[model samples]
Target: SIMKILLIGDSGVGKSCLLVRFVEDKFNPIDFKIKTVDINGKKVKLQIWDTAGQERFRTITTAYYRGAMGIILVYDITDERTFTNIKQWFKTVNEHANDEAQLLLVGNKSDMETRVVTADQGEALAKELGIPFIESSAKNDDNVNEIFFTLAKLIQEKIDS
Candidate 1:
């Protein structure tokens, strides 16, 4: 079965990088794309929609939130503003996505300078949202694959049940 995933975050937070890293195994700062991969021997096609993080796209992005099996809410570790916006992102997902949609909060740019938002902060927020949390570095290829694969595996479990 196909699992649609949406990556949402502030601009330049590496949402596209995470997608490219997972699908292509390489980092390229660019636009949105779809990639399918095999998980647990099951062919899973991930329609990874990258919502350009801009105020103008809010309405358009929210429409894509529907029917998403998994939503990755990303934030930049080096930028506090992105992290601060997590609550708004959460609100958007909770209000717009399927009630059963699984969510993962990601803190990107772990390889960069001292992070503005600590892993602890991200974890705390994830705990509050009752969702999985991970800090990853797309540039270093850290946790790039795990995030998607983990979400896909979980979604598969849900479907099987």
Candidate 2:
């Protein structure tokens, strides 16, 4: 069985950068964003549905959430509004993914802490949802790869059982 992962977050939350860092092992701070991804491999292929966070793309993107194995709900550490809207994203994923689907709350752009959401807040959110939470900076490569690969390992363990 293949893994179907979804990357979702508010627009400009660095979803594209996170994917680039995870897949290509390279990421740079930039403006141009990512909208879609499909990676095929011998052992396990990944079809990632990257949704546009902007309001205009709502109608078209909702169609891509048919079946998702896992989801990464991301928010910028410096953006209070984005963090606050995580519940909305969680609701969207809960409505779309299977009941047993796993989720990860990712606080991106943790490299710069000038205006970051405190670790306490992040921890609180994770504790509230009872899911794995990680803070990463795609630019500096902080736990970005661990986000998906670790989840894949967990999914594999489930199958083995």
Candidate 3:
């Protein structure tokens, strides 16, 4: 099945970092440019929708919700306020997405020891929302592949079960 995925979070929260890890297996701290991504030969043509994580773009960003098969709700582990904003993000997805769509809550920047949200916290929040969770770091290649692959597995399970 073709699955549409979205990477979303507050600006500077490493949303692009996660996207980079998924698409290119690399990370650039100084780069903040928008670009299209295609993962050919993978059967998953990932149209990674990246939005400017700013207040002015909230309306513009959430507009990509239509036809999304899944959403990777990401937030900076060291930024507490980003976690608080997660509900709003999910709400937008829920509002615009198909009822059978999937969501994976992600806590980005696991490379940092001083985090506002821990793996435990991320797990619990995901459990509370009844979705899969993972802590990832795009720079160090930590769970960078796991996040999307696991979400693919979950999507498969949902289809078979």
Candidate 4:
């Protein structure tokens, strides 16, 4: 299934980094890009959109939610504020994204030893939101591919069902 995946979170949460890791297999600080990937031997077009977190861009970024099939709510594990902002992001996605769209809670910067948001916290929130949770590091390539592939698989399963 073709998936329009959105990477939403506060700035510096590694949204762009994670996208680069998955799409290009390299890390570079950048913004909105599209890529088509082969998942489980099926060609899946991915419209990966990144909104550089800013008050001005929230409206623009969330506007794209209407078309998204999967939404990743990312947060920097080292930043408490970013973690706190996940609820607001969740609310926005629920309000604007497709009613059946899947949601994933990601605690990024997992390689950081100075993390303020623990994996358990992420898991707890994910449980509360009834979504899957993963802690990943874009710089170290931890679970970067897994997140994208998992989302793609979920979308595929949804379409098939």
Candidate 5:
């Protein structure tokens, strides 16, 4: 019935933008958002927290990692630096999370025509990280729900089993 999902990435990688688009079906800055969604014919609720990626703020936002059923590591497809930073983010996520929560590697900003990171690059990184991966564009409503739903399903199955 309830899922705690955490989304994080480098500043300006569209963490807030993605969640706002999913929760409100639009976009903006937000620290927390909640929504009830249907997962495999069951009504499920989620408390999605989008945290600041700046290291200076982790002391505050890292506290949000507790009990997160799913943790999504996002990067901008058009920003090579953001993609390169995923390794660091993944390390931090593993350090703070309580258990082996479902992890998803997402390449956001796919709507942009000029991309520095390719789909193959993202998929390969996800494979190397041993997490599910997807390309999403909150601005275009592409794979937004699929990303959340995929993680939610993983969480529920893992918990319920």
Candidate 6:
């Protein structure tokens, strides 16, 4: 299946850092990059895309937003405000996405010792919000790959299941 993914959050929520980690260390959220991955032994074309500045407007670009198969809503675990903004981001994704799209909630900066938000809260919030969720530290190289791979797996399941 051909799929596109997007990560959205506040400006300092480490969205770019997570993207760099996912791209394996190149530091830019350029237009898009394609990955040849397999899920359940089937080859999947997964495209990771940038927001093109629309997120600043508290929205996403119409065409790409509609095309996104996997949408990531990110937040900084160290910042309570970032987590607070997640519900708004979730609403935005729902307003723009179709039923075929899948959503994931991410708590970034999990490796930070000084955190205002706990992992349990993050997990519970995800459950309450009704999406797959995980806590990751981009700078520490933790769970970054899982974000993309899991997204592909979910998309593949969305197709086959």
Full-model lDDT for every candidate:
0.84, 0.74, 0.73, 0.84, 0.87, 0.83
List the pairs of residues colliding in candidate 5. Answer: none
lDDT of predicted model 1: 0.84
Off by more than 4 A, model 4:
28-31, 52-57, 60-63
lDDT of 5 at 104: 98
> Each model's TM-score, in the order given?
0.89, 0.82, 0.82, 0.89, 0.91, 0.91
Alpha-carbon RMSD to native, per candidate: 2.2, 4.7, 4.3, 2.1, 2.0, 2.1
Better of 1 and 5 by lDDT: 5
Top candidate when judged by TM-score against the true structure: 5
**Candidate 3 backbone collisions, by pair:** none
Q: Which residue window of length 10 is worst by lDDT in model 3?
A: 30-39
Error (Å) of candidate 2 at residue 141 is 0.9
Stretches of model 3 off by over 4 angstroms after superposition: 30-42, 52-56, 60-63, 159-161
Model 6 CA deviation exceeding 4 Å by range: 26-30, 52-54
Clash pairs, model 2 backbone: none
| Candidate 5 residue-wise lDDT, 10-121, digit = tens | 8888988888889889964356688999888999999998774554364425568877889999999999999999999888888888676899999999989889999999
lDDT of 2 by residue, 39-80 (tens): 233266566656545533663254465566678888999999
Better of 4 and 6 by TM-score: 6
The stretch of ten residues in a row with the least summed lDDT in candidate 4 is: 53-62
Off by over 4 Å in 1: 28-32, 53-57, 60-63
What would the per-residue lDDT of candidate 6 be over residues 38-128, giving only the tens digit for each residue?
7888787778886655567655768868678899999999999999999988887888887789999999988888899998999999999
Q: Positional deviation of 119 in candidate 3, in angstroms?
A: 1.4
Summarize candidate 4's per-residue lDDT along 1-161 as a digit string, tens digits: 45888888888889888988987888755456777778778788888887765634545444677678888999999999999999998997787888879888899999989999978898999999999999999999999988988888888877778
